[PDB]
Design an enzyme around this catalytic site. Structure first.
Site, PDB file in Angstrom:
ATOM      1  N   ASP A   1       0.860  -1.127   0.092  1.00 24.57           N
ATOM      2  CA  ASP A   1       0.005  -0.008  -0.015  1.00 24.57           C
ATOM      3  C   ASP A   1       0.889   1.130  -0.167  1.00 24.57           C
ATOM      4  O   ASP A   1       2.021   1.254   0.500  1.00 24.57           O
ATOM      5  CB  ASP A   1      -1.058  -0.056   1.296  1.00 24.57           C
TER       6      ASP A   1
ATOM      7  N   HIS B   1       1.312   2.789  -9.399  1.00 26.10           N
ATOM      8  CA  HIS B   1       0.858   1.445  -9.763  1.00 26.10           C
ATOM      9  C   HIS B   1       1.881   0.785 -10.464  1.00 26.10           C
ATOM     10  O   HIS B   1       1.576  -0.315 -10.779  1.00 26.10           O
ATOM     11  CB  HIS B   1      -0.631   1.441 -10.090  1.00 26.10           C
TER      12      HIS B   1
ATOM     13  N   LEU C   1      12.426 -19.692  -4.635  1.00 23.18           N
ATOM     14  CA  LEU C   1      11.446 -18.921  -3.775  1.00 23.18           C
ATOM     15  C   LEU C   1      10.125 -19.284  -4.425  1.00 23.18           C
ATOM     16  O   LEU C   1       9.696 -19.348  -5.464  1.00 23.18           O
ATOM     17  CB  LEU C   1      11.608 -17.333  -3.593  1.00 23.18           C
TER      18      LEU C   1
END
Lengths: 240, 230
Positions: free
Chosen positions: A23, A40, A134
């Site tokens: 955020d 974004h 990962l």
């Protein structure tokens, strides 16, 4: 009569699993004067960067909140832009992650998404499913309520087909039916200053350590990450 | 089956009342003497909260995880809770508090069950602050009992898989809407420790190093002031 028996029925240092609420992108854009949608553009790149730092520290799983199931409440324009921005970002960064042996999964209600996004997701999952580095889990059209509800429906479905009895329902069984499963996040990082979870992983956060920071996501780097790990290691030093 | 295209002062405060054992250590007391302050302190917090216009408090008294302790520890904690509740329930009623217990009451000693029923009836007329005491309770437990209940209804022909939605699930849980606006945990740890899971979706979290027995009106006011500026 449905029973309860808790006294009986008994039951997921570097963090092995880190969860991320990414955020602060719209704020980072208000500061610095750009339009809203520019911040974004930095989300998926920054995430890939964090995977690289994390991979080198020995972290094994990252679950990241990309598109909340409550984003359908935004303007049809804002949401349609976000789903397009995301489909683009995925194909750009696909190779970068896959090359470095990362495995990729998507959690969320995929059947609501554009058909092109669905096809790209299924391809991404299949070609990386063998990778041994990962594990990156992307929550896309996902929510805490949604995960518990889909698990409940699956369990009810099995009971209706004679495959399970109501007294077989326990923590382990419910856990196997959720989209985000064991082992659960050891540490949760939310950037951007807010101190809430906003319906991201309810069941899975029962024992998670919470770390909130005011750094906006686009400004979040390796130093801030090792800070949070360092913080996490403090708390284990003052607790059993 | 998959489709998601509707799934100031705090009205409801949730409380993790931790740090009692640590408080006892720092004062040379017996390890469990800090626990004797819990229900008295909670009554005090209720009274301050009631005067500020807070309407609901949910407090974590006995976790489903406590069963993993020794038999001695468990018998003491359940006995201490029955004793504290018997001493304070009339006092609480006189402050106009209404009292409910959530959790699995069938595992508790029968005297504690009787005391719980008496507490509930005496106070169920009160129109002041609603105090919910979570006793033999946890987040996993609430979700699981709601699941079992729904499964049982489906077996008996009272609902279909397609009827399972956020509203249906909410009405089967023991801690129901409206959910906590603010959660306060005393004692320094920054986790929820399986208190509430479903109910905390949008809750604000406030952590403080203050130990619970030292938690006063000022500490509460900071927490609310902090909440307001969000």
């Amino acid at each position: 009569k449905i029973s309860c028996s808790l006294n009986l029925q008994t039951e997921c240092l570097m963090p092995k699993h880190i969860a991320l609420i990414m955020d602060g992108n719209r704020r980072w854009a208000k500061d610095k004067g750009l339009e809203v949608y520019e911040g974004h553009k930095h989300i998926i790149p920054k995430l890939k960067e964090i995977c690289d730092i994390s991979s080198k520290l020995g972290i094994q799983i990252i679950t990241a909140f990309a598109f909340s199931t409550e984003n359908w409440k935004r303007s049809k324009e804002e949401v349609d832009f976000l789903l397009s921005l995301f489909e683009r970002s995925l194909k750009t960064e696909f190779q970068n992650l896959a090359k470095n042996n990362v495995r990729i999964s998507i959690i969320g209600c995929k059947s609501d998404l554009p058909m092109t996004l669905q096809k790209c997701i299924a391809l991404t999952e299949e070609t990386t499913k063998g990778n041994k580095g990962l594990h990156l889990v992307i929550a896309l059209n996902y929510g805490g309520y949604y995960d518990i509800l889909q698990a409940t429906k699956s369990i009810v479905n099995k009971a209706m087909n004679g495959l399970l009895d109501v007294e077989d329902i326990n923590k382990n069984l419910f856990d196997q039916e959720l989209e985000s499963k064991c082992p659960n996040p050891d540490l949760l990082i939310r950037t951007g200053g807010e101190q809430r979870v906003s319906n991201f992983l309810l069941w899975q956060l029962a024992y998670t350590e919470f770390y909130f920071t005011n750094t906006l996501f686009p400004d979040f780097g390796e130093e801030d990450l090792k800070e949070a790990i360092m913080n996490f290691q403090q708390r284990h030093r003052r607790f059993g």
